[PDB]
């Protein structure tokens, strides 16, 4: 049977998202690395096999020990098993007397990130809705506090972006990289925020984050910041919806108003001072599916975090749309 079956059989009230403590090392050490998949800012991602089964191994470099730690810490203390959230398997610290090596094992998805996918493919109206719907579901699942044993505290991502969403073979998405996530422990009205020299990717930072006004003592502030970023992601997707051959080239949000690798200051000028947002083509107003997407984008982009849509609501209006088009 599969690693996912295994994770299920070994589950006990008290277990985390993946395998039990000792089993994690057992599996991590038995994995056979196959090929480097990507060399991101935070270490390499390898395709690996475990007793034949394909798995994903992110090997972090010294500097992100804190990102490695937080992501693993979250999957471990928060029950996160959802079809729209990257499946966690095990974390391992393999320090050889020569050089420490931080491992993160998870499900494998050949397509890679939404970013790689959108660069490679244009998408259908249906494909767009699948991508967006599933992204909203994943995010709505993270943001939600679920009562009970199989429960879960609310979580804010803090670094949502094309590159942190993976797309499965069935055209659906799952959110990944929980290295900067914050947990809401409503049982003490506290916000668990882990220490890291790292902060969100600058082009996706919400206005309140760019200008430092975000009230970090209120959990809602974090969810609202994610929404703004999800909105930019929806823009990236819609931009690639191809209807009758017409679509755009892939682009990151603010690609036209900002230099590559934007500084907080540069993003701040465009987003807070100039109050600009990515361009929404007039043509999207004709086709109903893009019109709903466009309306969602705008509801995600208000400077005032409190006026933004909720991940659940986006999930809902997207569900209604999905049924009016089979």
């Amino acid at each position: 049977t599969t690693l996912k079956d295994l994770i299920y059989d070994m589950t006990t009230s008290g277990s985390g998202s993946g395998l039990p403590l000792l089993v994690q090392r057992t599996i991590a050490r038995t994995i056979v690395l196959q090929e480097s998949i990507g060399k991101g800012r935070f270490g390499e991602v390898w395709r690996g096999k475990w007793r034949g089964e394909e798995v994903a191994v992110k090997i972090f470099s010294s500097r992100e020990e804190r990102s490695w730690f937080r992501e693993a810490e979250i999957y471990q203390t928060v029950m996160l098993r959802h079809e729209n959230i990257l499946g966690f398997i095990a974390a391992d610290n393999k320090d050889n007397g020569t050089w420490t090596q931080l491992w993160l094992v998870s499900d494998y998805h050949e397509h890679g990130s939404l970013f790689d996918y959108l660069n490679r493919y244009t998408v259908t109206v249906e494909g767009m809705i699948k991508l967006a719907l599933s992204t909203a579901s994943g995010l709505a699942h993270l943001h939600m506090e679920i009562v009970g044993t199989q429960g879960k505290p609310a979580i804010a991502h803090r670094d949502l972006k094309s590159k942190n969403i993976l797309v499965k073979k069935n055209g659906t998405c799952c959110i990944a990289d929980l290295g900067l996530a914050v947990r809401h422990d409503s049982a003490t009205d506290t916000i668990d925020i882990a220490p890291n020299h790292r902060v969100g990717t600058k082009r996706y930072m919400a206005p309140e984050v760019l200008d430092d006004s975000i009230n970090m003592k209120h959990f809602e502030s974090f969810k609202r910041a994610d929404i703004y970023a999800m909105g930019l992601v929806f823009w990236e997707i819609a931009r690639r919806c191809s209807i009758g051959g017409i679509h755009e080239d892939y682009q990151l949000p603010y690609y036209d108003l900002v230099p590559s690798d934007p500084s907080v200051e540069e993003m701040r000028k465009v987003v807070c001072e100039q109050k600009l947002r990515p361009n929404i083509p007039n043509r999207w107003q004709s086709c109903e599916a893009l019109r709903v997407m466009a309306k969602i984008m705008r509801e995600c982009w208000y400077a005032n975090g409190a006026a933004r849509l909720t991940a659940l609501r986006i999930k809902k209006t997207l569900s209604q749309l999905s049924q009016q088009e089979g």
């Binding site: 006990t12 985390g16 090392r25 057992t26 050490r29 810490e73 471990q76």
Partner: protein
């Protein structure tokens, strides 16, 4: 390192050797008594190959001393367990672990 205190005697002579697979039942706790893992709760024995470092050092050296059938308390110091890092969400940094181990058999 590791201290091994017998709780129940084994056959007294069958000690795991490098390369063999140990099958055991365990329950891990932090010094204060809070459990953090237990193959017993799972009702499924845990298996590891001695020598390939699939387990912490205190285990590889601690179980190498029980003989088949033995049940013992392995008290492992941080440098023989998860050291300074600890294990995210489960084991605090600089944690001394206490395991209740039973070597069921070898393969």
């Amino acid at each position: 390192g590791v201290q091994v205190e017998t709780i129940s005697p084994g056959d007294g002579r069958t000690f795991p050797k490098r390369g063999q697979t140990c099958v055991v039942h365990y329950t891990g706790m932090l010094e204060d008594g809070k459990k953090f893992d237990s193959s017993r709760d799972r009702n499924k024995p845990f298996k590891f190959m001695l020598g390939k470092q699939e387990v912490i050092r205190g285990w590889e050296e601690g179980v190498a001393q029980m003989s088949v059938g033995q049940r013992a308390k392995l008290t492992i110091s941080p440098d023989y367990a998860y050291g300074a890092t600890g294990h995210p969400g489960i084991i605090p940094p600089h944690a001394t672990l206490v395991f209740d181990v039973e070597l069921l058999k070898l393969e």
